Amino acid sequence: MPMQMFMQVYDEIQMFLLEELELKFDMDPNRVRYLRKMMDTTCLGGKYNRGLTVIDVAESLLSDGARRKRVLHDACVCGWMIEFLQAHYLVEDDIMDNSVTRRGKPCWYRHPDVTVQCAINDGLLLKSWTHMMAMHFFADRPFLQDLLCRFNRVDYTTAVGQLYDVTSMFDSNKLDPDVSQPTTTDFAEFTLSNYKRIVKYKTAYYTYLLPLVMGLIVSEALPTVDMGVTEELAMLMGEYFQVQDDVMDCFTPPERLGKVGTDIQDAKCSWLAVTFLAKASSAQVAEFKANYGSGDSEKVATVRRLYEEADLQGDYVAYEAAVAEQVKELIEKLRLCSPGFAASVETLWGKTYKRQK
Amino acid sequence: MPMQMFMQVYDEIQMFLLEELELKFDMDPNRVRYLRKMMDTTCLGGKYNRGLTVIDVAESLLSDGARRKRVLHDACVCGWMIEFLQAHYLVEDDIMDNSVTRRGKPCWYRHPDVTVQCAINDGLLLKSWTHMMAMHFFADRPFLQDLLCRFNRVDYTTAVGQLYDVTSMFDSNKLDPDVSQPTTTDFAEFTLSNYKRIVKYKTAYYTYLLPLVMGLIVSEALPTVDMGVTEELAMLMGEYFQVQDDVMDCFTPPERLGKVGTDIQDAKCSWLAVTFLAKASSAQVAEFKANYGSGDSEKVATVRRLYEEADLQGDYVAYEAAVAEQVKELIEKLRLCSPGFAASVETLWGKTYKRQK
Ligand SMILES: CN(CCCCc1ccccc1)CCC(O)(P(=O)(O)O)P(=O)(O)O
Ligand SMILES: CN(CCCCc1ccccc1)CCC(O)(P(=O)(O)O)P(=O)(O)O
Ligand SMILES: [Mg+2]
Ligand SMILES: [Mg+2]
Ligand SMILES: [Mg+2]
Ligand SMILES: [Mg+2]
Ligand SMILES: [Mg+2]
Ligand SMILES: [Mg+2]
């Protein structure tokens, strides 16, 4: 049912946007249908976990069935703002990471009749829609300002996190626009501390904290919860969530994930990379620096192998257990003064813990 | 004094941005350096015509000591929001139009140590900053919602224009995300009405209509002018402005313009291109199609050669005169009830009419 009306509001939004493009932007049918396909390919195709969470939080907190419908509808729009925001990130992300597949299908910039230059712009259009839809529905809403302040900061912090992610192969001390530099060879920068910063900003905020806050805002209950504990949980579940993505990027079959990993080729500072270098032996670390950050398959195979050889799946489990009980503890601290919020928060966790996706 | 006070609020804005990233975003001194240089290289180097216009419009309309400098500061912030927005477009546009030089210096993505994927993200960062500085300085001003609504609007419509720009060289009938097609061979879609559409949306709104609008907003004078006549002026000055951009791309010397043209290699629907086709003879129209859209040295020269012989200046000066006359009378309509405003519009026109760069 949540998923039912979630798709109903999607159609509203798609109608409003595309129609306006024809009525107020002098757009021709061919281009109007192109945006439809671009929208559907990039926004539909996922499990909508960020969007659906907003509804759950809103519903779980609204405790005259109009107030219920008001909060419900708004929660769905706020739901699609993040889904569209995620749609925006992934389009640009796939481009930057030179990815091939996304959600079982080719990445947007990989579509035969979608140019890279146009893909970039579509990615921007996606971001502009979040604002366009919000302004259309929340027009006369007391929280409109607060909603967008927090929405944009999260977007901003996520872009910053992508700065950290995109520039982790480079010795930050040799980071100067006017002078080039190649992939690091010592990987001194590949530290858990540098990994944690990357993940906290590029993933955590928009994937866990944002969905929670928007649901709290439409529910007019933000001041009721302990924003501090809530923040601690969002960062914790966020990191964990990203650590999973990193392992799945290397071990989960492309068809089960719906995308072909590029971390090894892109010499990304993944969790698997910083955890390996931290425990591996002289020879292991050497064979790594010699085969990492390359497209060659025997070079790629080597890095995959070396990961297994080093048994990272065991470090993972210990990490997962650490988080699992750290999350449980925080939720109990939250459950004390806000049981309604506590429940919705645990559902988000349960959707994360040991996911295969 | 305007430029000076404008350039000081700049630092006041840069300080805030970078110092925030140092503590609240956990950024290392190196990346804070990289962003400072990026911010200075992408937001500085131009002539600041959009920002400066906002200040002029604003102080021209305040008709209480500090009340004045208050409005003066607000106008400078808005001035930089557009400059930053323009900086955002220009980085993403040089990447899209695969340009080489910008404002004298090499395009941002062309910089020695600026990777394309990072460049893309830096541009997104530049956009994020327009919202960041806005909320910081205007979190108390009542006009904030409108100010940001009108801002995102123009921003949206501009991305929509960029959509017409990048898809103009392709027969929109075969436009379909799954099947690729070459650059239109017949160039049938290169019509003046289609040119007018792309121009009105990718230039007019944010280059002319926005500065006037923000200036009216920060001065609380928005409702004292005939928006209908104001928009007619913006759309008219914007088209003309963009038409000059196209001519300068083919005929103005790089060292003076500050950039190397790419409209001919990118097979862009330029004013020169549509005006040519609309008058050229069979031979000319034929040879045109055989050399346009290529990156080859001599072919590109052949296109200029056909542009000159087609005597496209005679139509330009005629067009300019047609516009000059149409703008004049519109400005008079404005003067009737908005003298002060009309005056600021004269200056803006004065900076557009026969500009060189
Ligand atoms: C959290 N991440 C990026 C969020 C993208 C954030 C962003 C911000 C600004 C501009 C572009 C993208 C999402 C996970 C990944 O995308 P995926 O595995 O889906 O490719 P990656 O592992 O490559 O990070
Ligand atoms: C006003 N125009 C930007 C249009 C860019 C619009 C845009 C860019 C990126 C994202 C959204 C919209 C500016 C003129 C050009 O930039 P330039 O000659 O400076 O390259 P172009 O002739 O390429 O348009
Ligand atoms: Mg990435
Ligand atoms: Mg990726
Ligand atoms: Mg990944
Ligand atoms: Mg362009
Ligand atoms: Mg360009
Ligand atoms: Mg140009």
Breaks in chain A (C to N over 2.5 Å), named by the residue before each, are 63
Phi-psi region of A48 (alpha: psi -120 to 50; beta: other; left: phi over 0): left
DSSP annotation string for B48-96: -HHHHHHHHHHHHH---THHHHHHHHHHHHHHHHHHHHHHHHHHHHHHH
Cβ separation of A177 and B112 shorter than 8 Å? yes
Chain A residues 173-192 within an 8 A CB cutoff of chain B: 173, 175-181
Rounded Cα distance between A247 and A4, Å, is 32
Q: Is the CB of B124 under 6 A from ligand 1?
A: yes
Task: Decide if B354 contacts B248 (C-beta within 8 A).
Answer: no
Nearest ligand, measured from the Cα of A257: 1
A255 CB burial (10 A radius; 0-12, 13-18, 19+): exposed
Parallel, antiparallel or unpaired: strands A101-102 and A105-106: antiparallel
Contacts of B175 in chain A (CB under 8 A): 30-31, 34, 113
User: How far is CA A29 from each of CA A23, A33, B57, rounded to the nearest angstrom?
Assistant: 11, 6, 39
Beta carbons within 8 Å of B169's beta carbon, 6+ residues apart: B183, B184, B266, B267, B268, B269, B293
Q: Which of B258, B302, B293 is nearest to B100 (CA)?
A: B258
Which tokens sit at B321?
């005169």
Beta bridge partners of B106: B101
Inform me whether the C-beta atom of residue A242 falls under 8 Å from chain B C-beta atoms.
no
Q: Please state, as a whole number, how many other Cβ atoms lie within 10 Å of the Cβ of residue A291.
A: 19
Inform me whether the C-beta atom of residue B118 falls under 8 Å from chain A C-beta atoms.
yes
Breaks in chain B (C to N over 2.5 Å), named by the residue before each, are 63
DSSP annotation string for B119-170: HHHHHHHHHHHHHHHHHHHHSS-TTHHHHHHHHHHHHHHHHHHHHHHHSTTS
State how far Cα B202 lies from the chain centre: 7
Cα dihedral: A215, A129, A93, B30 (round 10): -80
Which tokens sit at A164?
């950290």
Cβ separation of A112 and B33 shorter than 8 Å? no
The structure was resolved to a resolution in Å of 2.5
Domains located in chain B, CATH noted: 1-357 (1.10.600.10)
Which residues keep their CB under 5 angstroms from ion ligand 8?
B 249
Rg (alpha carbons) of chain A, rounded to whole number: 21
DSSP A113: T
Look up residue A142 and give its amino acid: P
Q: Which of A92, A132, A156 sits opposite B120 (nearest CB)?
A: A92
Q: Is the CB of A128 under 6 A from ligand 2?
A: no
Alpha helices in A200-270 (DSSP H): 210-218, 227-251, 254-257
Cβ separation of A114 and B175 shorter than 8 Å? no
Q: Is the CB of B203 under 6 A from ligand 2?
A: yes
Burial A107-132 (b: 16+ CB within 10 A, else e): bbbbbebbbebbbbbbbbbbbbbbbb
Q: Is the CB of A239 under 6 A from ligand 1?
A: no
Rounded Cα distance between A126 and A109, Å, is 14
Rounded Cα distance between A58 and A212, Å, is 9
Q: Tell me how close the Cα of A138 comes to any Cα of chain B, in angstroms.
A: 12
Cβ separation of A128 and B159 shorter than 8 Å? yes
| Solved with | X-ray
Parallel, antiparallel or unpaired: strands A105-106 and B105-106: unpaired
Rounded Cα distance between A265 and B215, Å, is 49
Opening angle at CA A71, ends A69 and A75, nearest 5: 115
Cβ separation of B28 and A172 shorter than 8 Å? yes
